[PDB]
Design a protein around this ligand. Structure first.
Ligand SMILES: [Cl-]
Length: 290
């Protein structure tokens, strides 16, 4: 049995055991295993269960869809749909059945029509079958945490672990020049260079948030006026934080100082460090003028 993360946002990615992800990313996984050569055999059938359980013990992914079940280049999901047993972590029964924040269980022979399913699998006896599915990186995917999954295949088991995923974040502390006084209501936008194209962050799911940003998705625009205006809180230690970012270079661009202040540093260049909140909370001064 194998498990791999094969795509991010429907683009193929290189196989490795650790991937950096952004919040809102759609991750494609594949779990592959062999149909027994004697899947069709009489013992009354020898096989009455053919189960795939896939789960994560840590938060950060929401189940999206079972996308394909393929063998020998043939997608057989259309033929199998409605005949099998299936539950995911989106279903109300999941938590009490399998106490994990993410996962699914597919029992090829546990549904209403196991004979039909067994007959189909018998056409591909001894061949490798791939179950593909997607998940969505959600607002509970926090930095400083590598999270992985486990798949188990059983006929009454074999277990494998998938790759780990992680995300980045950053913290700033906007303050009055010369002191540690927290300044609320400074306005920033988040900028990056994607190749030679300057782009700005659009955060979904952050209406009503200030200071702490925990978006459900981050996309990028070349229309600067469409960028989400991020606001500092008056909090003590870090009054602007963002999570769910890919590693690399960014610029925090100050578009308005708080009332009674002027901008000192229009641009703050910084790095997101893969999988972490970064080296330190980045202090940014504003100049008092009242
Ligand atoms: Cl930039």
């Amino acid at each position: 049995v194998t498990k791999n993360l094969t795509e991010i946002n429907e683009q193929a990615v290189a196989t490795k055991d650790l991937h950096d992800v952004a919040v809102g990313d759609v991750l494609t996984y594949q779990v592959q295993f062999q149909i027994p050569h004697d899947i069709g055999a009489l013992a009354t059938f020898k096989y009455n269960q053919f189960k795939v359980l896939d789960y994560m013990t840590k938060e950060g992914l929401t189940f999206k869809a079972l996308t394909a079940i393929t063998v020998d280049g043939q997608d057989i999901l259309k033929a199998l749909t409605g005949k099998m047993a299936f539950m995911s972590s989106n279903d109300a029964a999941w938590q009490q059945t399998h106490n994990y924040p993410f996962g699914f269980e597919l029992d090829f022979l546990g549904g209403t029509d196991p004979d039909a399913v067994r007959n189909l699998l018998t056409q591909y006896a001894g061949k490798r079958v791939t179950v593909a599915y997607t998940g969505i990186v959600n607002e509970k995917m926090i930095p400083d945490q590598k999270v992985g999954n486990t798949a188990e295949v059983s006929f009454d088991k074999i277990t494998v672990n998938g790759p780990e995923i992680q995300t980045g974040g950053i913290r700033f502390f906007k303050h009055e020049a010369g002191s540690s006084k927290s300044l609320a209501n400074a306005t920033f936008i988040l900028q990056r260079m994607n190749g030679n194209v300057r782009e700005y962050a659009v955060l979904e799911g952050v209406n009503g948030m200030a200071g702490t940003y925990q978006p459900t998705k981050i996309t990028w625009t070349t229309n600067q006026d469409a960028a989400t205006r991020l606001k500092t809180s008056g909090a003590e230690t870090a009054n602007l934080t963002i999570q769910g970012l890919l590693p690399g270079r960014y610029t925090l661009v100050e578009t308005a100082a708080p009332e009674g202040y002027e901008i000192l540093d229009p641009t703050t260049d910084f790095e997101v460090i893969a999988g972490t909140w970064g080296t330190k909370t980045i202090r940014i001064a504003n100049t008092p003028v009242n």
